[PDB]
Design a binder for these strands. Structure first.
Ligand code: ZN
Lengths: 23, 114, 83, 181, 69
RNA sequence: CGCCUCCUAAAAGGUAACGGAGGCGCCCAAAGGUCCCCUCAGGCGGGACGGAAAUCCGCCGGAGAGCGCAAGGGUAGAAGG
RNA sequence: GGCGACACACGUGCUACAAUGCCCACUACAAAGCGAUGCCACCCGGCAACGGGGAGCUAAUCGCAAAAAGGUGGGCCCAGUUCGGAUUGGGGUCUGCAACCCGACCCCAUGAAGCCGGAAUCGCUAGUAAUCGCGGAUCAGCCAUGCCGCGGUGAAUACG
RNA sequence: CGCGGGGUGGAGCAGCCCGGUAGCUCGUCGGGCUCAUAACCCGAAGGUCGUCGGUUCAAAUCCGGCCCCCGCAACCA
């Protein structure tokens, strides 16, 4: 869900960047 | 089958690896790369040599089922021994990572007790 | 945790007092206020009464507790249950 | 009778090795495997699924020998088992089936054990008789995960001609029982 | 042996993850096994198979000695 | 209030008391007959669930077990399974 | 050190219990704001956080900054699951003198309850509700799911 | 002490006859409703069945003992 960091969904909701959501 | 457990034939290999304790989505997409195996293949569609290759590779690249759990308990048990706050938290069955014990500790405390 | 690129933080007065006993032989339980400080491998075999906010809790520093902060072992709170 | 490699190991090396290690005056003084007993104290089929003969089938697959049924020697309140009630299967593997089953045990069964750090070096009768237990039955190659439905463990009582646990563990060690300690 | 109750034994080929063949007698002629004696950890010098650290703690204090003394 | 068991009951039997203890008013088509086979309780050690006590193994046991039910007698060289 | 406890209890929210869905790769489409010891473009390294370079930007011109849902293609096939992310172990980055109590974030693994919720109870009549994302204040950093705003798509129903 | 009966969750009672599993009301806890309280609604919890022995594989539930309580009698004088 939104609260899952490992999903790109999460890093969207969490507003972060990482292995699963680059820039 | 594999190191300690079996993956369902009807599922793809990617989800197949994940059922191993100590194997999540990350390494699951990795062993296919390091073993050059199609992720889309069902476990019912996996060849012996590919599996044994898979079996040989992954089961030594990491410890997964029993060997992995022991380190956890080893880490956890030794914390109880050292009397660290972290270990202090575990011996109370309380959220060890600084969560708020006053409310919403159910996942660490389970059923509510008036 | 602390950026290992950055140095591994330990208070100056703490470490020096550690090496002093390391120099002058193991002795002299050391009061301390540096809960934020990290245990260092040299600290093994020492005994230090770390301050909790009210008291100095004497904690014997073994090898088994080297890679940690000192505040971990002086619990700054008192809970005994309910009823 | 039929040939079995492990028994061959017993005669070839195990006999002379024990003789050297102890200098037995007679070859009848050296240890031997009297029989290998297999028990499953089910404690479940006695009440429900009283025909869990399928488990006996599993024993037959692992042993090539259908186990006999053991019933309650008396009723019990706590153990919800009236007397004369099948509670555990049992088979008694002997010479040929003994060496065979043992061979499949060491070569496959133990190494298939989850986190098998070895056998207890202490699970001895005292008379030179070893006992152990299993928590599942799918260890054996005859049994597949497809055919298995519930994890019935078991117990194994390997009896030995020897009198001490000394010569016993010496023997099985020569037989290569991997002792975790 | 009661003639009719015991499942008849045959030569049985053991096949390990090593491809180790082990001739035995069983109710399955050809048989495969994920593991044998020639591959099990406890038999292979224990091999560590993932981790040779062996109770890495405590230190293992690498990144240390940065103190100024 | 009738019958069984034990003491009373005095080493034959029988022997009283509103004397001291318990039972019976059935049950088994096998719990009967016969042939064949086996031997218990209990204790210890070992044994996945599983324990105090399931089933298994070894070891020690003359019977202290069991023998449908009260007690007694009898009993494994079986009346026991 | 405490305000962060913790048997519990209540309120307010967030995330879900999935297929009108989840995940992945590509293509869009905003508004409103912020930024000189800050935005930081772009490059490199690094799984990544991030670090090293480093232009421009004093602001309609530089950047923050991708909007997201959406569309496209693929997988998943009803599964406590490719749902769920809670907890926990470990390894790291960053700020900070110092992240044990007591930060955030990155990575692996762990993968909890939860299958639409009793009594009961709340908001909403239109660009509203619902859902999607963006910005700012405080602030070194952030415990922000909050607050204040911005825009995307976009309902049903009012007999009385 | 002679006879009969009973002594189950905090209270009042059930389950006993037929031993395999103890239920009801009230009450308590929590929540809901109320400005709050009661009432009410939802939910939740919770019983060596006197005590001691024996019977039983197993006893609240069988048996015996003790204790308490209750009812009945304690007579011809
Ligand atoms: Zn092998």
């Amino acid at each position: 869900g939104k609260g899952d960091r490992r999903t790109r969904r999460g890093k969207i909701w969490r507003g972060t960047y990482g292995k699963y959501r680059p820039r | 089958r594999i190191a300690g457990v079996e993956i369902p034939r009807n599922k793809r290999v990617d989800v197949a690896l994940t059922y191993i304790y100590g194997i999540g989505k990350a390494r699951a997409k990795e062993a296919l790369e390091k073993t050059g195996i199609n992720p889309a293949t069902r476990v019912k569609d996996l060849t012996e040599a590919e599996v044994v290759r898979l079996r040989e590779y992954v089961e030594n690249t990491w410890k997964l089922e029993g060997e992995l759990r022991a380190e956890v308990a080893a880490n956890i048990k030794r914390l109880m021994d050292i009397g660290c706050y972290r270990g202090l938290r575990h011996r109370r069955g309380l959220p060890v990572r600084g969560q708020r014990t006053r409310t919403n500790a159910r996942t660490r405390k389970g059923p509510r007790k008036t | 945790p602390r950026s290992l690129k950055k140095g591994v933080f330990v208070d100056d007065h703490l470490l020096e007092k550690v090496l002093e006993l390391n120099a002058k032989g193991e002795k002299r339980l050391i009061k301390t206020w540096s809960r934020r400080s990290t245990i260092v491998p040299e600290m093994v075999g020492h005994t230090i009464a770390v301050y909790n906010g009210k008291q100095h809790v004497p904690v014997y520093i073994t090898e088994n507790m080297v890679g940690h902060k000192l505040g971990e072992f002086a619990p700054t709170r008192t809970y005994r249950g309910h009823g | 009778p039929l040939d079995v490699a492990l028994k061959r190991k017993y005669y070839e090396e195990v006999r002379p090795e024990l003789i050297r290690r102890f200098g037995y005056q007679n070859v009848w003084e050296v240890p031997r495997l009297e029989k290998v007993v297999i028990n499953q104290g089910l404690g479940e089929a006695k009440e429900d699924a009283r025909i869990l003969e399928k488990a006996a089938q599993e024993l037959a697959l692992i042993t090539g020998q259908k186990p006999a049924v053991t019933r309650a020697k008396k009723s019990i309140s706590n153990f919800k088992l009236r007397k004369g009630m099948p509670i555990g299967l049992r088979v008694t593997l002997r010479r040929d089936r003994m060496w065979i089953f043992l061979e499949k045990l060491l070569n496959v069964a133990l190494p298939r054990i989850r986190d098998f750090r070895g056998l207890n070096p202490n699970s001895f009768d005292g008379r030179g008789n070893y006992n152990l237990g299993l928590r599942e039955q799918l260890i054996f190659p005859e049994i597949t995960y497809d055919m298995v439905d519930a994890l019935r463990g078991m117990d194994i009582a390997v009896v030995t001609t020897a009198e001490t646990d000394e010569e016993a563990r010496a023997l099985l060690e020569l037989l290569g029982f991997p002792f975790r300690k | 042996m009661k003639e009719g109750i015991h499942p008849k034994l045959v030569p049985a080929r053991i096949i390990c993850g090593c491809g180790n063949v082990i001739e035995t007698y069983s109710t399955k002629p050809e048989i495969y096994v994920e593991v044998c004696s020639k591959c099990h950890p406890f038999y292979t010098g224990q091999q560590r198979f993932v981790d040779t650290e062996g109770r890495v703690e405590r230190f293992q204090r690498r990144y240390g000695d940065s103190y100024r003394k």
